[PDB]
Design a binder for this molecule. Structure first.
Ligand SMILES: O=c1c2c(c3cccnc3n1Cc1ccc(Cl)cc1)CCN(Cc1cccc(Cl)c1)C2
Ligand SMILES: O=c1c2c(c3cccnc3n1Cc1ccc(Cl)cc1)CCN(Cc1cccc(Cl)c1)C2
Ligand SMILES: O=c1c2c(c3cccnc3n1Cc1ccc(Cl)cc1)CCN(Cc1cccc(Cl)c1)C2
Ligand SMILES: O=c1c2c(c3cccnc3n1Cc1ccc(Cl)cc1)CCN(Cc1cccc(Cl)c1)C2
Ligand SMILES: O=c1c2c(c3cccnc3n1Cc1ccc(Cl)cc1)CCN(Cc1cccc(Cl)c1)C2
Ligand SMILES: O=c1c2c(c3cccnc3n1Cc1ccc(Cl)cc1)CCN(Cc1cccc(Cl)c1)C2
Ligand SMILES: O=c1c2c(c3cccnc3n1Cc1ccc(Cl)cc1)CCN(Cc1cccc(Cl)c1)C2
Ligand SMILES: O=c1c2c(c3cccnc3n1Cc1ccc(Cl)cc1)CCN(Cc1cccc(Cl)c1)C2
Ligand SMILES: O=c1c2c(c3cccnc3n1Cc1ccc(Cl)cc1)CCN(Cc1cccc(Cl)c1)C2
Lengths: 177, 175, 175, 176, 176, 172, 176, 175, 174
C-alpha cells in the first residue's frame, strides 16, 4: 500500500508529506480528476503564501488537453514562482506544464525525455482551435517562434534535457545538487 | 492484509521505511517509480549521510520509470545500498547496479538479467537503449561493446557471474 | 455478402483477377501477403508480359508482410501499375511507390503517408526501418537524408505533393 | 473478515501470531508474499537474533524465484527456524519446509509433502539452471545424493510425513 | 456490512471470538483453514483447559485445507464443541464428527453428507486421500472401514438422528 | 453510503435496540451474520424480545432453516415483521415468529411457493422439511400446505392472517 | 475472401492452384492443424511423382516445436527434392524448415528476416531435450559446430539473407 | 483454408481417407472418437483385409473417447498401421501402442509419453480407468504390470527408440 | 472437418445409409430431435432390418433422453445398441433399451446408471421414478435393486453390467 511516515506524533502518508513541503507531483496520466486534484493543491499552497515557491514533479505521458489547460491557467493565475521538475518522461501536455514554469526555474534530471508532439468527441474546427492554443502557449514559454513550434511538434520524436534547454522548454539540467 | 508491528504500531512496510529500507518488489511502472522517488527524497531529508537500503525483487518494467528511479538514486547525496532477492531483470538489474560502489549485494540464489525484453518511433527505442548502454558501462566499468553484446544474450546471470561483470559487489550468505 | 456477376458466374473479386487486377484493400498482414503474392505469381504464369494492376486503399500494416509483397513485385517481370484510391499509409505508400516507373497513379482525393505508425528487440526495429529508407529512396529518387527526415513528419500528403516527391507519377481524374 | 484480538492494543490475529514469532506461509508463493514473509523474518531477527522463529507452511508451491528469496532469507538470519507443515507442502513449499534448522522441521499427521515440480518467459537453458539449483538445495538439507534427488522429483506423487522423515525432508511427525 | 457491538467496540465476529467461538461457515479453502488454525492456537494460549466452540455451516471444501483444520483440532488440548447448523458436507461433516467425544451437536433441521463431491492430482493420489478420510471417519464414528467406504459411495444427506446413529454427532438439540 | 448516528453506524444502532434486519436474499453469509446477531442479543437478556425485520425474496433453503432453528433455540420471544415482501424462506421465518407476535405492514406481499447440487430425492426431503414447518406454525394440515405451495401466488397480509402466516396487520 | 481461378472447366481457389504446381506456401504460425495440411500436401505431392521438385514458401514467425519437427521429418522422408523459399520472414521453427530444404535449393528474397533464436506445460528436462534436438538438426543442415549453433541461438536477433547464406541456413539470394 | 486435389475432386483429407489413411491429430474427445470410429468402420466395409493407416499427432485427451477408438481398432479385422508424427502422449501413445504388432512406426524426432497428465468422477473411478490403462499397456508392450505402473509414474517423454525398446512401437524411420 | 467418401457423402451421412445412428456426445433437445428423425426415417426404408445405435455419451437432458427412448420402443425395427467409450446417465438407459439379445459393449467401456447432481422437487422426483421403471423393465431387475444401484456414484465394467442386465454381449472382435 501507500507507506506512512511519522514525525514529532502526527502520521502522514507520503504524498501528503510532500504537499506539506510545497510539492505537487504530476506523476500520472493527465485527465479531469488529476487536474481537479492539482488545482486544489496549487490554490491551497498560495493560500499558505502568495510568494513562497511551489514545486511540481512532472512524470507524465500527456493526457486530456482541456485538463492540462485547466492546470496551466491555474499555474499562471497563482502568484507564486513555480519550479517545474521533469524526472520521468515529459510528453504531450506534460511537456506543456514543464515549459510553463517560472522562467529560469524549469529543471530536468539527466535521463528524462521530453516530447512536445501531441499523440493521435469533437469537430475538426474545435480540435484545430485547441492545437493553436498550445502553439501559442508553447511559443509564449519555449520562446520559439510559432512556426518552429509547429515544425517541432509534427516531428514524432523525443528531446534530451540538453535539447529541451536549447529549445527553451526548460532552464537547467542538473545531475547533483 | 498487511500485519502491524509495535509505544506505537505501524504496518510492516512503513516500518521498513522507518529503518531507511525502500522496497522495490514487483514490476516497475510510473506508479512504483513515483512512490519510490518520494521515499528516497523523504529519507534524504532526515539524513543526507545515513545510508539508504533498496531491496530489489523485480522482473523489470517501464524504462522511463526505472530511469526516474535511477536519476533520483544518483541525485541524493546518501550512499545507497542495493539488495537483490529472487531476481533483478531488465530495469531491475539497472537499479541494482546503480547502487553505491562496493555496496551492491545479492543473496546466493538470486538471478540477474540485464537483457531487455522483446508505442514509439524506431529511433526512440534505439535512443533509450543506448542510454542503458552508457548507464551500465558507467557502473559495471565494462565497455559499451561488452555491454551491448551481453545484452544481446537472452539468459540470466548467477550472483557470482554478475559480480564478475560489475553489476554487484558482495554475495552475502550470512551477515 | 459479395455480389456475383455473369460472363459461368464468378464473385466480383475473382472477376477483377480475370482482368489482371489485384486488390490490396485494408490492413496488411501475413494472410493478405499470401493472397497478394499468390495472385501476382499466378498472373505472371498466364503471361509474364502483360501488366498487372494493383489497387491500394490501405493504412499499412506488418512491415515484414509488406516487404514480402514488395520483393514479389520486383521479382516478377510483369510491369505493375499501382493505383492509390481513398488513402495510403505506412506500408501502403511503399507498395504504391514501388510500382513500375511511370505507372504509379493516384486519384484526386487520395491521401498518402510515408510516416510509420508507432515483439522484437530495439536494434532489429532499426534495421527494419532503415531497409524502408533504402526502398523509399530508390523509388522516390530522394536522398536517404531526405527520406529519413521526411518519414519523421507525422502527416499525410496530397496526390500532387506525392508526385512532387517521387512516390507516384500521375494524378488522374479520368483517362 | 479478519478477527480482532485485544491484549491495551488491538491486533489482527495474524499480527498476533507474528507477535509470538510465528510467520504464516499459507497458500501460493508469489512475489508479494515473499516480500511480506521476508520483512517478517528480518523484523523478527531485529526483535531477537537468538529466539527461534516458527514458520507455518500450508502451500502448493508457486513462483520459484520467490521461494528462493524466502529460502535465501531463512539461511541469512541467525535465528533457528522451525518449519511446520500443516495441510500440505508441495513444490517450493516443501523446499521451505526442508530448509528448517536441523532437528526442528516438523509436520502434522495429515500433512502431504511433494518435491516434484509442476509443469516471466524464459529460455529453455534458464529453466534447467533453476531445476539444478533446487537439486542442490534439496540434497543439502535431506542429505541425499543428486542422483536420488533427481529421480525422486521425477515422480508425480506425494509423501506421507514419515516417508518424508525417512527421506530427510522433516525430523518430527507430532500428534501432540 | 458487519455490525458492531460495544462492551470498547467489536465487529460481531470478533465478539464471538472472545467467547471462544470459532465460525467455520462457507466453503473450506486455504484462507479459511488459515484463520481457523490461528484462532484455535490463539484460544489454546488464553487457556488450554477451557472449551472452544465450533460452528459449522459448510458445504465442503479443499481436502487438504480441511485436514489442516482437523489436525489442529486434535493437536490442541482443549475440548472442542462442534455445532452443525444449516449443513455440514464432506470436509465440513468431517470436522463436525472430529469434535470431542460427547460434544458433537446439531440443530434439528441441519443436514449431514459424508459423500465427497466429484492443483490437480494423479489417480493414485486422490485415492490416498480418499483412504485417509476413511480412517479418520472410521476413528471418530467407530464404524468399520467397510461401513465408511460404502456410506460415502451414496450421494445423499442424512438427518441429525441418522448422523447420530452413524456416529458423526452425539446430540440433536432444539433448546438448552 | 452508510450513515452515522451519535457514535455508531445506523445498522449497528438498530441491533442495540434489539432489532435484526433480514433484508435481502438469504444465503450462508446472511445466515451467519443474522444468527450471530440473534445469539448476541440473547447474551443481553433471555427475556427482552428480539425484533426481526423481514423483506426478503428467499434464498438458500439450508441458510433459512439455519436461522429458523436458531430462532427456536434462543429463549427470547422473537417478533417477526414483514415490512417487506416475504417470499419463500422469508415467509418461512415469519410463521416461525413467536405465537401472537407476527406482524406485517399493509402493502406487504407474502408467498410460500418455492421458486422453480443435489439428487432428485433430496430436494423432496427438503420440500418436506418445509411442509412440516409451516404446518406446525400455521396450524394447518400438511395437505392444505402442500396444495397452497403449488400455487405461484402471493397473499395480501389479511389473507395470510387467515392462513395463519401472521397475526396482526398494522398501519400504526 | 479467397479468389477463384478457372482452367478449361475446373475452378480452383488460389491456393489449390499453387498446390497443383507442386508449390506449398507454408506461411503463418505453425501448430498441429498447420502441421497436418502441410504433411498431407507433401505426402500427396510425392504420390503424384517422387522425382519432380516440391516448393515451399515460408513466411512464418515460428510456432509449436513438435509441429515443426513433424513437418521437418516429412520433408526428409519424401524422396522429392524440396526447394524452400523465404519471403518476408522465417523465425524459430520457420528458419529450421527453411534450412531443411534440399542442399543448393534454399532461397530467400532480398528483404527477408531470418532468426534461429527460440522465443521465451512440460518438465525442464524435456524442454531441454527438445532444444538439443534443434541444435543437432541445425548443425546437420548448416554444417556448423554444435557450440556455434548454441551460442548463435541465445542471441536475440535476426539475420539478413546474405548473412544467412554465410551461416549455412540458405544457399541463394535471388532478386530475379 | 483446406486445399482440394483431383483424381474427381476431393478435399485433401477425404483424399487421405480414400487412401485408407485415418488422421488422429489434436486432442482426443468424443467428436474425434466418433469421426475416427466411423472412418475405421467405413474402411473395413470397403476391404476387411487391406491395411489401414493411422497418423498420430496427439497430446492425449478424454480417456473414454480414446478407449472407444482402442476397442474399435481391436474389433475390426483389418491390420492397423500406426504412425507417430510429432508427438504421442497419454491416450495418443496408447493408440500408437495398440497397432497391429510389427506395424507400429514413428518418425525420428517424435516424442512419446505414457504418463497420464493431471464428466467429473470419483476417486475409485479414476483408478478404475487407470488400472484399466495399465492392463492395456502391459497387454501390448508385453511388459509386466509392475513395470507399467512405475514407468507411467514418471513425468517424462521417451525417444522413438526408447519407446520401441519398451514395447510401444516396432520401427523408427531414420533418414 | 468432416471427410467425404465414395455419389459422395460425408462420413456421418454414410453411416446412416448403413442403418446406423450414433449418439456420440451429450444429449439435449437438439440431439434428440436429430436422433428421432433418423430412427423414424430408418424405419421408413424398412421396419424389419436391424437399426444399429452407437453410444459414447455422458448423459444429458432427461426429457431428451426419454424422447429418444420412446421413439426406440415405438419403431418396430430391432435395435442393436453398442456402447464404446462410455455410457452414463441417459446414455446407459438408451444402451439398456436395446432389443433383447442385441445390446453390446466393447471391453474397455465404462457404464454408469447413477444420475449426476429449472423445476420443482416433485417434478424431478417424478422423472426419477420414471427412470426407475424403465431400468427395471429392461435389466429385468427389481425396482429395489435398481434404485440402490443408482445412489452409488460409480461406473460398471462391461462384464459387471452384463450380469446386472444392462447389456447382453461383451465382445472383443466378431
Ligand atoms: O484562490 C482562491 C480563489 C477563490 C477563493 C474563494 C474563497 C476563499 N479563498 C479563495 N482562494 C484562496 C484559497 C483558499 C483556500 C484554499 Cl484550500 C485554496 C485557495 C475563489 C476564486 N478562485 C478562483 C480560481 C482560481 C484558479 C482556478 C480556479 Cl478553478 C478558480 C480563486
Ligand atoms: O529534495 C527536495 C527537493 C525539492 C524540494 C523542494 C521543496 C522542499 N523540499 C524539497 N526537497 C526536500 C524534501 C523534504 C522533505 C520531503 Cl518528504 C521530500 C523532499 C525540489 C527539488 N527536488 C529535486 C528532485 C530530485 C530528485 C528527484 C526529483 Cl522528482 C526531484 C528535490
Ligand atoms: O512463380 C513461380 C515460382 C515458383 C514456381 C515453382 C514451380 C512452378 N511454378 C512456379 N512459379 C510459377 C507459377 C505458376 C502457377 C502459379 Cl498458380 C503460380 C506460380 C517457385 C519460385 N517462386 C519464387 C517466388 C517468387 C516470389 C515470391 C515467392 Cl513466395 C516465391 C516462384
Ligand atoms: O536486517 C536488516 C538488514 C538491513 C537493514 C538495513 C537498515 C536497517 N535495518 C536492517 N536490518 C534490520 C531490520 C530491522 C527491522 C526491520 Cl522491519 C527490518 C530489518 C539491510 C540489509 N539487509 C540485508 C537483507 C537480508 C535478507 C534479506 C533481504 Cl531482502 C535483505 C538486512
Ligand atoms: O501454539 C503454539 C505453537 C507454537 C508456538 C510457538 C511460539 C509461541 N507460541 C506458540 N504457540 C502458542 C500460541 C500463542 C499465541 C497464538 Cl496467537 C497462537 C499460538 C509453535 C508450534 N505450533 C505448532 C502447531 C500446532 C498446530 C498447528 C500448527 Cl500449523 C502448528 C504451535
Ligand atoms: O449461545 C451461546 C452458545 C454457545 C456459547 C458458547 C460459549 C459462550 N457463549 C455461548 N453462547 C452465548 C453467547 C455469548 C456471547 C455471544 Cl457474543 C453470543 C452467544 C455455544 C453453543 N451455541 C449453540 C448454538 C445455537 C444456535 C446456533 C449455533 Cl451456530 C450454535 C450457543
Ligand atoms: O506416403 C504414404 C504413406 C503411407 C501411405 C499409406 C497408404 C497409402 N498411401 C500412403 N502414402 C502415399 C500417399 C498417397 C496419397 C496421399 Cl494424398 C498421400 C500419400 C503410410 C505411411 N506414411 C508414412 C508417413 C510419412 C510421413 C509422414 C507421416 Cl505422418 C507418415 C506414408
Ligand atoms: O462395422 C460395422 C458394424 C456394424 C455395421 C452395421 C451395419 C452395416 N455395417 C456395419 N459395419 C460395417 C460398416 C460399413 C460401412 C460403414 Cl460407413 C461403417 C461400418 C454394426 C456393429 N458395429 C459394431 C462396432 C464395432 C466397433 C465399434 C463400434 Cl462403435 C461398433 C460394427
Ligand atoms: O413414422 C412416421 C410417423 C408419422 C408420419 C407421418 C407422415 C409420414 N410418415 C410418417 N412416419 C413415417 C416416416 C417416414 C419417413 C420419415 Cl423421413 C419419417 C417418418 C407421423 C406420426 N409419427 C409418430 C411419431 C413416432 C415416434 C416419434 C415421433 Cl416424434 C412421432 C410417426
Amino acid at each position: 500500500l501507500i507507506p506512512i511516515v511519522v514525525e514529532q506524533e502526527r502520521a502522514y502518508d507520503i504524498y501528503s508529506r510532500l504537499l506539506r513541503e510545497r510539492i505537487v507531483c504530476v506523476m500520472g496520466p493527465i485527465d479531469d480528476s488529476v487536474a481537479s486534484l492539482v488545482i486544489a493543491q496549487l490554490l491551497f499552497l498560495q493560500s499558505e503564501s502568495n510568494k513562497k515557491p511551489i514545486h511540481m514533479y512532472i512524470n507524465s505521458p500527456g493526457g486530456v488537453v482541456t485538463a492540462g489547460l485547466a492546470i496551466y491557467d491555474t499555474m499562471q493565475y497563482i502568484l507564486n514562482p513555480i519550479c517545474t521538475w521533469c524526472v520521468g518522461q515529459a510528453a504531450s501536455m506534460g511537456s506543456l506544464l514543464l515549459a510553463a514554469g517560472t522562467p529560469g526555474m524549469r529543471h530536468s534530471l539527466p535521463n528524462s525525455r521530453i516530447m512536445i508532439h501531441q499523440p493521435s468527441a469533437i469537430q475538426a474546427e474545435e480540435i484545430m482551435k485547441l492545437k493553436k492554443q498550445l502553439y501559442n502557449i508553447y511559443a509564449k514559454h519555449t520562446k520559439q517562434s510559432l512556426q518552429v513550434i509547429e515544425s517541432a511538434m509534427e516531428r514524432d520524436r523525443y528531446m534530451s534535457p540538453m535539447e529541451a534547454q536549447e529549445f527553451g522548454i526548460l532552464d537547467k539540467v542538473l545531475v547533483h545538487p
